[PDB]
Amino acid sequence: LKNDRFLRALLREPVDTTPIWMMRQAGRYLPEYRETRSKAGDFLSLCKNTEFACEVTLQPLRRYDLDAAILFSDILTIPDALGLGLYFETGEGPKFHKTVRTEQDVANLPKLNAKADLDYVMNAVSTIRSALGGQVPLIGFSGSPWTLATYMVEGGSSKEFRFTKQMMYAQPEVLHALLDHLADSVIDYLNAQIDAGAQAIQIFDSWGGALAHREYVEFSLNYMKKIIAGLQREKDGRRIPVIVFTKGGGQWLEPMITTGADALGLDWTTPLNTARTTVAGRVALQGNLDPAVLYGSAASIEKAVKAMLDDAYANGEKTGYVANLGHGITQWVDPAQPKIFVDTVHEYSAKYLG
Amino acid sequence: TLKNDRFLRALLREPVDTTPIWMMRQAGRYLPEYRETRSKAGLSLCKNTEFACEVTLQPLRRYDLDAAILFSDILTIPDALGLGLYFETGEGPKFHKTVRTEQDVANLPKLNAKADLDYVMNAVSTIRSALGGQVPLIGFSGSPWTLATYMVEGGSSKEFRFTKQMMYAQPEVLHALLDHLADSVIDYLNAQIDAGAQAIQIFDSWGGALAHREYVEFSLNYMKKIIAGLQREKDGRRIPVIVFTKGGGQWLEPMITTGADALGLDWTTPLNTARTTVAGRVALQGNLDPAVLYGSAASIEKAVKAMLDDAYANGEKTGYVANLGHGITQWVDPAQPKIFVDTVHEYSAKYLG
Numbered sequence: 001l002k003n004d005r006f007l008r009a010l011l012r013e014p015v016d017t018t019p020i021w022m023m024r025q026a027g028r029y030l031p032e033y034r035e036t037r038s039k040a041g042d043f044l045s046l047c048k049n050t051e052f053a054c055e056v057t058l059q060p061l062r063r064y065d066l067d068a069a070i071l072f073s074d075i076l077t078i079p080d081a082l083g084l085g086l087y088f089e090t091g092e093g094p095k096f097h098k099t100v101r102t103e104q105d106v107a108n109l110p111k112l113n114a115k116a117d118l119d120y121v122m123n124a125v126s127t128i129r130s131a132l133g134g135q136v137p138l139i140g141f142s143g144s145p146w147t148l149a150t151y152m153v154e155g156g157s158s159k160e161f162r163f164t165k166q167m168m169y170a171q172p173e174v175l176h177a178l179l180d181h182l183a184d185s186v187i188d189y190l191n192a193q194i195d196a197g198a199q200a201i202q203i204f205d206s207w208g209g210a211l212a213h214r215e216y217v218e219f220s221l222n223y224m225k226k227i228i229a230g231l232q233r234e235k236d237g238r239r240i241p242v243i244v245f246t247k248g249g250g251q252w253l254e255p256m257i258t259t260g261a262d263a264l265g266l267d268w269t270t271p272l273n274t275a276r277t278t279v280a281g282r283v284a285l286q287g288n289l290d291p292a293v294l295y296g297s298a299a300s301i302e303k304a305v306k307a308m309l310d311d312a313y314a315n316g317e318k319t320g321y322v323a324n325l326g327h328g329i330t331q332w333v334d335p336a337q338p339k340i341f342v343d344t345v346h347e348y349s350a351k352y353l354g
Numbered sequence: 355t356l357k358n359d360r361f362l363r364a365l366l367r368e369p370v371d372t373t374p375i376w377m378m379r380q381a382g383r384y385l386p387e388y389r390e391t392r393s394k395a396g397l398s399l400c401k402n403t404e405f406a407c408e409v410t411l412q413p414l415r416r417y418d419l420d421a422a423i424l425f426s427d428i429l430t431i432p433d434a435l436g437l438g439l440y441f442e443t444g445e446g447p448k449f450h451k452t453v454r455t456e457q458d459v460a461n462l463p464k465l466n467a468k469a470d471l472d473y474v475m476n477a478v479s480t481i482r483s484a485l486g487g488q489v490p491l492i493g494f495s496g497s498p499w500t501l502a503t504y505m506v507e508g509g510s511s512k513e514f515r516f517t518k519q520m521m522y523a524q525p526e527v528l529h530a531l532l533d534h535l536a537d538s539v540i541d542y543l544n545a546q547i548d549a550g551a552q553a554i555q556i557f558d559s560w561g562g563a564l565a566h567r568e569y570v571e572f573s574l575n576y577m578k579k580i581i582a583g584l585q586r587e588k589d590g591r592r593i594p595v596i597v598f599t600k601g602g603g604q605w606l607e608p609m610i611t612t613g614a615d616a617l618g619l620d621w622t623t624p625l626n627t628a629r630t631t632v633a634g635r636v637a638l639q640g641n642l643d644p645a646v647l648y649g650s651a652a653s654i655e656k657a658v659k660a661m662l663d664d665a666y667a668n669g670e671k672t673g674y675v676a677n678l679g680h681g682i683t684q685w686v687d688p689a690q691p692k693i694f695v696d697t698v699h700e701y702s703a704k705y706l707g
């Protein structure tokens with residue numbers, strides 16, 4: 001690796017400057033993404049299109065001095081591979097032809113053979129890893145068991161999680177069986193991504209923030225802890241750092257540390273300075289800028305990013321922080337603006353580092 | 355006279371005989387009698403004082419609740435300001451006109467709450483009479499930030515694209531909008547008090563979308579301004595004020611500076627740590643996930659007991675009102691809130707005698 005500052009920061013090793021990458025850094029806000037996307041087919045076939053996947057993964061790296069690439073894929077690969085039939089309904093988002101509702105439904109789920117069933121994901125990982133030429137590390141990822149379960153039980157996107165929470169409170173042993181199946185699936189999936197070339201791992205618990213605080217531990221967190229216990233710790237003489245991210249989970253930092261994750265993701269509602277003092281060097285932190293900050297002027301973005309770094313380094317620490325947004329880049333962002341974000345993070349860091 | 359005022363006492367950290375309880379959206383679609391009354395109404399609901407009064411009373415006939423809440427909508431204010439409220443099937447509330455520019459803000463009219471929203475005041479006074487002192491009546495408003503999101507986006511929103519764009523690109527324009535709304539809400543809430551409201555809740559339903567410093571600047575400070583302008587007492591009783599920012603649990607210490615008597619909590623916030631943090635400086639209201647009511651009777655009783663255990667773990671014997679952490683859903687079985695209410699009242703004896 002010519003550049004490994006991202007990995008060093010996550011592992012709380014000395015770094016020359018603050019690393020940065022951006023969730024959804026490959027996406028519609030880029031004209032070249034849309035142009036590439038138009039040559040492709042249906043929205044479902046994008047992830048299975050290895051050429052497309054590799055191409056759009058590389059595009060933000062050509063524009064911005066990012067310190068990591070992330071696999072272009074979808075968390076919903078796993079429930080599709082488990083046979084629930086993913087499709088997209090314009091314009092209501094992802095849906096499934098089958099839902100999981102009963103004890104027997106859960107028992108009937110097939111075991112995921114990720115290397116075979118999701119071979120197209122592994123081909124993307126390996127192809128991207130080759131294309132990167134060691135320039136920056138590659139992040140592999142999965143949805144969390146709770147977050148994947150919501151799609152499988154609701155049958156798609158959900159604002160209230162009516163059926164999954166009904167299962168949680170009325171049939172908890174059924175939901176636990178589903179979550180356990182998914183934890184094993186995610187272990188297989190992530191380890192296969194590592195085998196294929198992933199150098200860091202992020203678990204996206206996108207809907208864990210919907211849970212009541214005790215239920216977050218029982219029905220989401222404990223299953224992420226199980227996953228991490230099953231992952232390869234190292235590959236090619238290097239630690240593989242793991243990031244856990246539960247958006248809206250800022251009140252639950254202390255439980256999150258018990259997952260054994262190297263790093264925790266934060267959104268904009270969490271003060272970075274108090275999160276840093278609270279975790280006290282026990283884990284690294286990633287985040288946490290509101291993407292809408294990038295709707296402001298160049299000058300305002302610069303000021304906002306400096307303030308965020310001030311919060312990150314107020315406690316005197318010189319590592320353990322990766323700058324990022326608190327959610328994905330929106331499709332409305334002016335492609336000039338993330339450059340301000342990246343360059344300011346790298347340059348202003350000299351105030352605190354070295 | 356109030357035959358039952360334990361809700362008001364708890365909000366004011368005064369001694370109570372048992373834990374008070376009411377439920378957000380306790381009048382709503384989950385009740386078959388609501389659906390029947392609603393089918394006879396065909397917004398018209400909110401402007402029909404007879405309808406509004408009737409559905410407000412329905413949950414009180416069914417459950418031993420300790421408060422009634424005015425049946426209305428937070429969006430009465432932007433409708434009265436002329437943005438054209440309507441409801442799209444399966445999509446929620448919408449406005450024909452949106453606020454996007456400095457000129458749009460300048461063009462907003464001054465609200466005369468008692469006249470422009472006379473139907474709200476008539477509902478408040480009619481409900482107050484119909485209650486015959488049974489329980490206190492809660493009046494309410496949306497917060498300036500939360501009202502602003504609907505006015506700028508033009509309806510419900512997942513990302514708040516245009517409101518946050520305005521916040522970061524044109525903060526002076528958003529501040530002017532928020533200030534106009536703060537003045538409007540002061541007049542609206544004071545008019546509800548004049549009409550008979552005995553407690554006030556400010557619903558900052560989308561304040562949890564804000565970055566932490568922006569919560570203070572663009573939501574909290576405007577709720578602080580509102581509370582400073584409210585009538586404090588009427589008819590020999592204090593009028594307690596509740597501030598509720600769903601998703602705002604990380605911000606309890608700043609929230610105290612609103613001057614509110616009580617803060618609402620959702621299910622993501624541990625009640626025991628919240629109680630320790632506020633340390634008797636405000637009352638707390640909440641915080642059950644309404645989906646708990648999807649479980650068995652036995653499981654509801656267990657869950658509610660655990661919640662009260664959290665509320666009273668610190669040995670503090672007042673300053674707590676039980677509630678959900680959000681509105682009751684349309685899918686709840688009407689049998690289930692009775693278990694919630696009765697367990698709250700009975701189990702409290704463990705801590706309150």
Ligand SMILES: [Cl-]
Nearest residue numbers: 023024025070
């Ligand atoms: Cl991402």
Ligand SMILES: [Cl-]
Nearest residue numbers: 378379380423
């Ligand atoms: Cl309500």
Ligand SMILES: [Mg+2]
Nearest residue numbers: 459460462534
């Ligand atoms: Mg004006």
